């Protein structure tokens, strides 16, 4: 797992000048941190039981 | 004959694009010159690849 800036730095450097500003929200999102999604509940685990 | 103006224009342009440099009527062979329009595309290339 490399760091997010060197992925931003690489994938901005390998992006031509015409498709730069179109491709900036896909570099913003590829280096956004993971916030894991809410699964469905299936609550009351074995230590709560 | 409707495209006779086309062949007449191209006949001049083929002689003109490889135009030779004459010093005193003497042709200097191996005379390389870079245009003002060729050199102004080298600039606009260099200005655009620095701006990016």
Automatic annotation (TrEMBL), chain A:
Origin: domain of life: Eukaryota
Annotated protein name in UniProt: Mitochondrial ATP synthase subunit ASA6
Span within the parent record: 28 to 76 of 151
UniProtKB/TrEMBL annotation, chain B:
Organism this protein belongs to: Polytomella sp. Pringsheim 198.80
Residue numbers of the full-length protein present here: 207 to 258 of 618
Name of the protein: ATP synthase associated protein ASA1
